[PDB]
Each structure stands twice: as structure tokens, then as C-alpha cells.
């Protein structure tokens, strides 16, 4: 059998007995086939419904206990066996089971002792009986439990980012049944940026929270902090959802969605105007965003007809998410809490945004059609259909009850997107996976991202360029190195995937992959470096591993600076040079301009020797295990050499001018009739004029000063004339067109 065989039988008996009572009385016999088809979140709900009508059947109750046993939910499984046992006493093997499980989970309660006594008298002196007798003794004493607790605390002092240890603390709290302390630590730990990114931790967070909601302690204490803990559950679900989608398979991700949707339906009823309500708002958006990503995962593997229909469905999901407003940040108690929520807000808008675009780039106003056709409530049932099995009650499912009102159906603005990205860099602990995706998403767009601003948000007060550039010691790392690094990681990643899709043939849709579904986009080498330099900078390394981490970074530095044995293809170097020139040429301050321009000259000075050999159609010495994979896809050709020599010579003059060699700079600038040379020629003529323009000074000199301002005016005019005429030149502008016009207005009024 398969999934089709079992979900098609739904329509077989649905057409034979349609009343609700007989539909649920078939739940046990429905669940009979899902246990065989490996569906355990589904089989659970089928049998549980038959139990809602046949609550006195010992067979059905035991089957759920055996299913909760496969789920390893001891507290839930035990209770199920109990019901089957109290209905039918002849089930001896279940009296053993109850005794077996009670002694394995926790011995503190005498209930484990009681059921063991009964288990003994049903099986006199059997081999398992002693086994349980030794197990019950195994558990440690009060001094022993406190002893274990002290180890974890002393261990957590120096290792607060260890996933396993923090998990054990929650398990120890849960073992002493002081769940309030378990969630308390669970709540204070969702502020940890590292733990929030851990799949296993968030899963534990979901259980320890749920356990507390149903726990007797949650009700008795008070109903005031009840809302607070409820928020964390939603937060955990969002984080857990993001991670499960990437690593786990299609089946597990869908199952988590149902837990997410159940929680949302249970929360919306309270409402209010506090952190929980604001949290519900942001988490609501995440749900659709992840739901859209989940949809696209299924379609990727599937045929073309489902792909378009699913992507259409996903496009609506991301849209819903993007529409959701920025959560009310002020309304939260603390700075950490509010900053986190906003961080996630930026993440939602950024990821959904780029997805919305790449899906809208497929066709003309593709977004408009999606809304006009599926914004209809008919889509709400078509969405619920594709994602879930229709058998689940469509009433308590948040998805089926949401009010889809006035979908904006407005494509996102790039400027807004940039600020969304920059604000969400710290969303996923700056994993190179995170950044390599964004960098690639902007690779198809006409505006480029502020990487240098990304790096400033991660490594604060890291200098743009280090004074001691002579050595490769990794204490001299600079934001330029990282910017230079990320450029290659993305330039490398794009080419590798380009080669991959060529091999995949089938249907070509390279832009469409979402962030969770795709696998590692960088080489494990590259990822190891980024993870190292990150842990080092943020001061979350290990004294022992310091020297190793430190050396691992040092290994690649000589390559990021195009030094001895750099594994750099000439094309990648060129890409770095111009990408830094244009990045720097648009900057306002002199410190940063000089730095970015310097490195650009550096890489230029390293390429030109290579270009000369390539200019005569010779061979480049290929690398030895290069850091950035070489590709013949982008191997440099002779057709473009003379331009680069020209484009490079400008860079020389620009630096000569900045250094003071105006005579040589001007002599060079005038030599080449380039749009960029105008903005440079003009900018330096303007400065020679402005300073000398108004002081009392020799009249003859004043006329010569004015003469330069006259030259400034002309060159700005040459820029705009050639700009309005041709679009290709507009893109060559070192600064925005309006900035050139802005100066001109002031230049002429002078």
C-alpha cells in the first residue's frame, strides 16, 4: 500500500455511511491502515476519534497506548493502557507493561511500586519481574538527584551554548516534576541566540511547555503567567518550523504544521493587547511563510502540473505573510524581548519578499492573477486540501477560519527589502547558509545589497581595513576581508548550482528555490571558516581550540588577499575589483572610499599580469585544491581586455588624485572619455574652485578659480546629456543620477 491506497478508501466508506457517528465508529478501522502505512501523527487522530464514540473499547484504547509508545510519550501511553486494563482485567500483559514503563520513567511516585506488585502476582517470579525490581532500585536518591543537578549547573556555567546540557536540565527539572522551573529556564533560554537555532532544543521546548499547560501546577498556581509561557510556545514553533523544513523530510515537516495550526487556533480566542497578542501577530505571518516553503518542497520533487499549482498556492502564502504589519514592538516588557520579535519580523518580510519577487519574475504581473483567482475563499479549501488530509476537523484548524481580507497584491519595493535583510542578519546566527542565500537572491535583481552594512551588524567595531596588513595572522581580520569573502562564496555558489541545473535538465527554474529546502550552498571548507571566525569574534570559542580555530582562519587569509598560492581564478579577482570599486565609488566618506578603492587597485594589480598571458591565448596555471572553485563557464576572453585596462587605468588616476598626484591624475583622466571620469574630473575641479571662490585674494587668481567652476558645470552637463540618451551609461554612473543633478543645482547658483 501507499498514501493513495489509504486516503482513497476515505471516499469509499464516506459514500456508504455518511452520518457523523458511523464515520467516527470507522475510525478504529480507518486507523487500522495508517499504522501500516507509517503515519503516526495521522493514525493518532483517527483512533482518537473512534475513542470519542467508542470510549469503552479495550482494544482501541490499548492501540492508542501502543501508538503513544511508538511516540515515546510515556505519560500518554501509560494512561491509554490503564483504560484498556480497567475495562478488561484479563489483559495481564498490559499490567506488566504499565509496571515496566512506570519503573523506567520515574520511581519517585509509589504508583510505579503498586503496579509492579500486581504485575508480580499475575506472573509469579517471571524473568521480567526481577528485571523491574532492579530497575526500580536503580533510580538515585535525594542526595543523588541533587548530585546530578549540581553537575549540570557547574557544567552550564562555562558551557551555556551546549544544546545537550541545557536539555538535560529540563529533563532533570521534569524528573523532579518541578515543571514551573523547567519552563522558567526554558523561557529565559529562548533569549539565547544559539539555542533558538537548535532543532532539538526547540522540540524539547514544545514538549516541556505543552506538558506544563496540561500540568496541574499550571492551573493551581495562577492564571496570570499562563499567557507568558504561551507566547514562548508559539516562538518555539516558529523556530522549530524553520529548522524542520530544511533538515527533515516531507512527512515530518507537514506533521509539525498541524501542531502549529492547533496552537494558533487555541490562542486566537484570547486576543488582547499584550506581548502574546503581538506575538500571535508575527507568528501568524511565519505560519504562511513556512507553509508556502512547505508547499514548494513537495512540488519540487513532483511533476510540472502540480508545480505551477503549488507555486501559485505558495505565492498566496508568502503574500499573506508579507502583508502582515510589523508587530507592535513597544508593547513588550523588555528590550531583549522586543528586539527579538522585530528581528523575526525582518526575517519574515525578507524571506517572503525575495520569494514573492522570484515567483513574480516568471510572468508579467503574475502576482495580480494569484490574488484575483485564489484570494477567493475557494482557495482556502484548496490550500487546506493540498497541505493536510481533509479528515481532520476543518473547524479547529486556524487555516480554514482565517479572514483573508484585502490582500495588498503589491509587489515589494527593493528599498524596503534591503532594510528587511539588514535587520534580520542576526535572525539565524549569521550562518553562511543564511547569507549565501540572500546574496544569491539579490544576484537576479538590479539593485545590490549592502553587504558591508550586513557585516557591520554582525561584527561591530570591526575596522574596514587593518593597519597591519603585512602578515596573515587572523587578529588582523577586516570587514573588507569578509566582504571580499562573501562575494566569492556567492560568486562560487551561483556557478556550482548553474552547473547542477544543467545536469538536472527537466524544467529550468533556478531562481525559485526557497531558503529552508535548499542544501548547503557553500563548500564545507568555506562554512568551517565562517563558523570559526564567527565564534572567534563573538568570543564564544574554546581556550583549548583557540589555537586551532585561530590557525584554521589563518590558512585562508593568504587567499582572501590574493597572496602566495591564492586559489583565485582571474575572473573572480576581477569580480572582486570592480565590485569593490563601484561599492566604494558610491560611498561618501574618504576613509571608506580610500579603503575600498585600495583593495580594488590591489586585486587589479594582481590580475593584469594574468590578463596579459591570456591576451596572447596562453594557459593559466590552474590551482591546487583552490578555495574558490574554478570554472570554464566564466573563463575570461580576449574580447573584453582593452576595456578593463581602461577601467583599471581610471582607478589608478583616482587613487593618484586622492594621494595628491593631481597632475598625473588629470593628465590620465582627460585621456579617457568615460562617464565616470567626468564625475571625478568635476568633483576635483569643484573643490579647487569652492575653496578659492570667496576669500579676498588676487583678482587674477579669482578668475582662474572661477574658470574651474566653469569646467565643473560642463562635465556634470556631459554626464546628464549622455545619461538621458542611453540606459547602459546610466548603470555606469558611479553615483545615482539624482545625486549628479543635486550638485549641479548648487553648482550653478554659486
Amino acid at each position: 500500500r501507499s498514501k493513495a491506497d489509504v486516503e482513497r478508501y476515505i471516499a469509499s466508506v464516506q459514500g456508504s455511511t455518511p452520518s457523523p457517528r458511523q464515520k467516527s465508529m470507522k475510525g478504529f478501522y480507518f486507523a487500522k491502515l495508517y499504522y501500516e502505512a507509517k503515519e503516526y501523527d495521522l493514525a493518532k487522530k483517527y483512533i482518537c476519534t473512534y475513542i470519542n464514540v467508542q470510549e469503552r473499547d479495550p482494544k482501541a484504547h490499548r492501540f492508542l497506548g501502543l501508538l503513544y509508545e511508538l511516540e515515546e510519550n510515556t505519560d500518554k501511553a501509560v494512561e491509554c493502557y490503564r483504560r484498556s486494563v480497567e475495562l478488561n482485567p484479563t489483559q495481564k500483559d498490559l499490567v506488566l507493561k504499565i509496571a515496566e514503563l512506570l519503573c523506567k520513567n520515574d520511581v519517585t511516585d509509589g504508583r510505579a511500586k503498586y503496579w509492579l506488585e500486581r504485575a508480580a502476582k499475575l506472573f509469579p517470579g517471571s524473568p521480567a519481574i526481577y528485571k523491574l525490581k532492579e530497575q526500580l532500585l536503580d533510580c538515585e536518591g535525594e542526595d543523588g538527584w541533587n548530585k546530578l543537578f549540581d553537575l549540570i549547573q557547574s557544567e552550564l556555567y562555562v558551557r551555556p551554548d551546549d544544546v545537550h546540557v541545557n536539555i538535560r536540565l529540563v529533563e532533570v527539572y521534569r524528573s523532579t516534576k518541578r515543571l514551573k522551573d523547567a519552563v522558567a529556564h526554558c523561557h529565559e533560554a529562548e533569549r539565547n541566540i544559539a539555542l533558538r537555532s537548535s532543532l532539538e532544543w526547540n522540540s524539547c521546548v514544545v514538549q516541556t511547555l505543552k506538558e506544563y499547560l496540561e500540568s496541574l501546577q499550571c492551573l493551581e498556581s495562577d492564571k496570570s503567567d499562563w499567557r507568558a509561557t504561551n507566547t514562548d510556545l508559539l516562538l518555539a514553533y516558529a523556530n522549530l518550523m524553520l529548522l524542520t523544513l530544511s533538515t527533515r523530510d516531507v512527512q515530518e515537516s507537514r506533521e509539525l504544521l498541524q501542531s502549529f495550526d492547533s496552537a494558533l487556533q487555541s490562542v486566537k480566542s484570547l486576543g488582547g493587547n499584550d506581548e502574546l497578542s503581538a506575538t500571535f501577530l508575527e507568528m501568524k505571518g511565519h505560519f504562511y511563510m513556512h507553509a508556502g516553503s512547505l508547499l514548494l518542497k513537495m512540488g519540487q520533487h513532483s511533476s510540472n502540473v502540480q508545480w505551477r499549482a503549488l507555486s501559485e498556492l505558495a505565492a498566496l502564502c508568502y503574500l499573506i505573510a508579507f502583508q502582515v504589519p510589523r508587530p507592535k514592538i513597544k508593547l513588550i516588557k523588555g528590550e531583549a524581548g522586543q528586539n527579538l520579535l522585530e528581528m523575526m519580523a525582518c526575517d519574515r518580510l525578507s524571506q517572503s519578499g525575495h520569494m514573492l519577487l522570484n515567483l513574480s519574475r516568471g510572468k508579467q504581473d503574475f502576482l495580480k492573477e494569484i490574488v484575483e483567482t485564489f484570494a477567493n475563499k475557494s482557495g482556502q479549501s484548496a490550500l487546506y486540501d493540498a497541505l493536510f488530509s481533509s479528515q481532520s476537523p476543518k473547524d479547529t484548524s486556524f487555516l480554514g477560519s482565517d479572514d483573508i481580507g484585502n490582500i495588498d497584491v503589491r509587489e515589494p519595493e527593493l528599498e524596503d527589502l534591503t532594510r528587511y535583510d539588514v535587520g534580520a542578519i542576526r535572525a539565524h546566527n549569521g550562518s553562511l547558509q543564511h547569507l549565501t542565500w540572500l546574496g544569491l537572491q539579490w544576484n537576479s535583481l538590479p539593485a545590490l545589497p549592502g553587504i558591508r552594512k550586513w557585516l557591520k551588524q554582525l561584527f561591530h567595531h570591526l575596522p574596514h581595513e587593518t593597519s597591519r596588513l603585512e602578515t596573515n595572522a587572523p587578529e588582523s581580520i577586516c570587514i573588507l576581508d569578509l566582504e571580499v569573502f562573501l562575494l566569492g562564496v556567492v560568486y562560487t555558489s551561483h556557478l556550482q548550482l548553474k552547473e547542477k541545473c544543467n545536469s538536472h535538465h527537466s524544467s529550468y527554474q533556478p531562481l525559485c528555490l526557497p531558503l529552508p529546502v535548499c542544501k548547503q550552498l557553500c563548500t564545507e571548507r568555506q562554512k568551517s571558516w565562517w563558523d570559526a571566525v564567527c565564534t572567534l569574534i563573538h568570543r564564544k570559542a574554546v581556550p583549548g581550540n583557540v589555537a586551532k580555530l585561530r590557525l584554521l582562519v589563518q590558512h585562508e587569509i593568504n587567499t582572501l588577499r590574493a597572496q602566495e598560492k591564492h586559489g583565485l581564478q582571474p575572473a573572480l579577482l576581477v569580480h572582486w575589483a570592480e565590485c569593490l570599486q563601484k561599492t566604494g565609488s558610491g560611498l561618501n566618506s574618504f576613509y571608506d572610499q580610500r579603503e575600498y578603492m585600495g583593495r580594488s587597485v590591489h586585486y587589479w594589480k594582481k590580475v593584469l599580469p594574468l590578463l596579459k598571458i591570456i591576451k596572447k591565448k596562453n594557459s593559466i596555471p590552474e590551482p591546487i585544491d583552490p578555495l574558490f572553485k574554478h570554472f570554464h563557464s566564466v573563463d575570461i576572453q580576449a574580447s573584453e581586455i582593452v576595456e578593463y585596462e581602461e577601467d583599471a587605468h581610471i582607478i589608478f588616476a583616482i587613487l593618484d588624485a586622492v594621494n595628491g598626484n593631481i597632475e598625473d591624475a588629470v593628465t590620465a583622466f582627460e585621456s579617457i572619455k568615460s562617464v565616470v571620469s567626468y564625475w571625478n574630473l568635476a568633483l576635483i575641479f569643484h573643490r579647487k574652485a569652492e575653496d578659492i571662490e570667496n576669500d579676498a585674494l588676487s583678482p587674477e587668481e579669482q578668475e582662474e578659480c572661477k574658470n574651474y567652476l566653469r569646467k565643473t558645470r560642463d562635465y556634470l552637463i556631459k554626464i546628464i546629456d549622455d545619461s538621458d540618451s542611453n540606459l547602459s551609461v546610466v548603470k555606469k554612473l558611479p553615483v545615482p543620477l539624482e545625486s549628479v543633478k543635486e550638485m549641479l543645482n548648487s553648482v550653478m547658483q554659486e
Partner: antibody, heavy 129, light 108 residues
Framework: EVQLVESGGGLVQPGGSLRLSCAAS????????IHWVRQAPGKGLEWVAS????????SYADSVKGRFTISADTSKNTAYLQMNSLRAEDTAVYYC??????????????????????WGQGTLVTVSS | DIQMTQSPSSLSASVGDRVTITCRAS??????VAWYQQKPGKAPKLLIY???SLYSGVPSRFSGSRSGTDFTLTISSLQPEDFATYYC?????????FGQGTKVEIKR
């Protein structure tokens, strides 16, 4: 261009709490180990806390162990000395200083620092009810 | 616990003298000792690191030396600007300790 600035001092009552701020600039804060060294009036230098260069494992003198807490923030490029259960005995001039990774060596049984190159001006802390 | 015993506590000398201060480590300690100059009220400044290596910028008349567990600071020709208090410092495993200090008073 390179300096250390101490702040967050002032007077406090015994059994109270304070928080000192050692602001650094000009050298990469990640690769530097941070220390605090107090000096009562007319007395000598007393080491009270340390933070290993690249990770930040703490180490305190037994005279203040468990009461003080020293921390380092990469985003703010600043170190702090959190002080609790302050006693009249803690009245002293508190200095901070760095020791590069070049001078920070890790060995079996604990770590050692070759010397303290950069020192701060020193912020005064008075503890008296 | 390791202890750095500094001697003398208070010294009196005049200009040009060849002055010597010594610190003894109770336990056998490796060459991870330092020396500092602290003028009244000001901050302490680093003179010698790693026992006998001179900190860049410190005058050449300062020199450190070791013999067994006794470390010694040596000034070849005393100058007027060196009349201040000095301290010796050891860095053992996850612990730092300073000497009691040595005041260099002008003799008259």
C-alpha cells in the same frame, strides 16, 4: 588612538551593587584578554578578575569569588565588572587592562598572561554606609 | 597557592645608581613574570614582559633576569624619572598575583 576608559564607579552602601564599564578602542576587542586590578588607598595592586582572550572563561581571586562577575560584549566593544554584596573592604581604585592573544597562553590546569600592556585611567569606587 | 614575595619594600637611592629589585616565587614558576612602574595615583605601566623581554618603547636601561625561582629587575643607570613604585607580577594557571611593591625614594 588606542585607550581604555573606566566608568560606572561612584559610591555605594555596603551589601549593595555596582557595575563598572571599561570602554576599549583601537585594538581588536575579540583577541584581547581583559583584566581588572583594584588598589585601596596606600595599598598595592590586587588582581580581581580575568577573561580569556578569544572565549571568555572567568577566573576570580578568592577574596571576591562568587560575588563579582566580569563580562565582555563584542557588539559594544566594552568590558564590565559586575560587583555584588559589596563590603567596606572593596573600597579601592579599580583599573582595567588588556593582554593580547600573543601574550595569552593556555596550559593544563589553567591559563597564564605574560603581562598587561594597556591600562585605563582608573575609576574610583567607595564602599561605606 | 603561589606567592610573589617582593623585596625590598622601600628603597632609597640617588641618580646614576645601579638599582636592583627581586621577587621570589614560592613554587617553581615558568618564565611568565612581568614588571610594572606605577607613579603616584597614575596608572601602572609595563616595563618588562616574559621575564627578560623589554616592552616596546621602554628605555633600554631596564632589564629583567631570572635565577632559579628569583626574578630580578635591573636598572643600569638610574634617572630622576624612575623614582616611583614598582611591582612584580606572576601569571600561573588561571590566577595572577602581584608583589607587595617597591618604592624608590630619592636619597639625601
Amino acid at each position: 588612538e588606542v585607550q581604555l576608559v573606566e566608568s560606572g564607579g561612584g559610591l555605594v552602601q555596603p551589601g549593595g551593587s555596582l557595575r563598572l564599564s571599561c570602554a576599549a578602542s583601537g585594538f581588536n576587542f575579540s583577541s584581547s584578554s581583559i583584566h581588572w586590578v583594584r588598589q585601596a588607598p596606600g595599598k598595592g595592586l590586587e588582581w580581581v578578575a580575568s577573561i580569556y582572550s578569544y572565549s571568555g572563561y572567568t577566573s576570580y581571586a578568592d577574596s571576591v569569588k562568587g560575588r563579582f562577575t566580569i563580562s565582555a560584549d563584542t557588539s559594544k566593544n566594552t568590558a564590565y565588572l559586575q560587583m555584588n554584596s559589596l563590603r567596606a573592604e572593596d573600597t579601592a581604585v579599580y583599573y582595567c587592562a588588556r593582554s593580547p592573544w600573543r601574550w595569552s597562553g593556555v596550559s593544563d590546569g589553567g591559563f597564564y598572561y605574560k603581562a598587561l600592556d594597556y591600562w585605563g585611567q582608573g575609576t574610583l569606587v567607595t564602599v561605606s554606609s | 597557592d603561589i606567592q610573589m614575595t617582593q623585596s625590598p619594600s622601600s628603597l632609597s637611592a640617588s641618580v646614576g645608581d645601579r638599582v636592583t629589585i627581586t621577587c621570589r616565587a614560592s613554587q617553581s614558576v615558568s618564565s611568565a613574570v612581568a614588571w610594572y612602574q606605577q607613579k603616584p595615583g597614575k596608572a601602572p605601566k609595563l616595563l618588562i614582559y616574559s621575564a627578560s623581554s623589554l616592552y616596546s618603547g621602554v628605555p633600554s636601561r631596564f632589564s629583567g633576569s631570572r635565577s632559579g625561582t628569583d626574578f630580578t629587575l635591573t636598572i643600569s643607570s638610574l634617572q630622576p624619572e624612575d623614582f616611583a613604585t614598582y611591582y612584580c607580577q606572576q601569571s600561573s594557571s588561571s590566577l595572577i598575583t602581584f608583589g607587595q611593591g617597591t618604592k624608590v625614594e630619592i636619597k639625601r
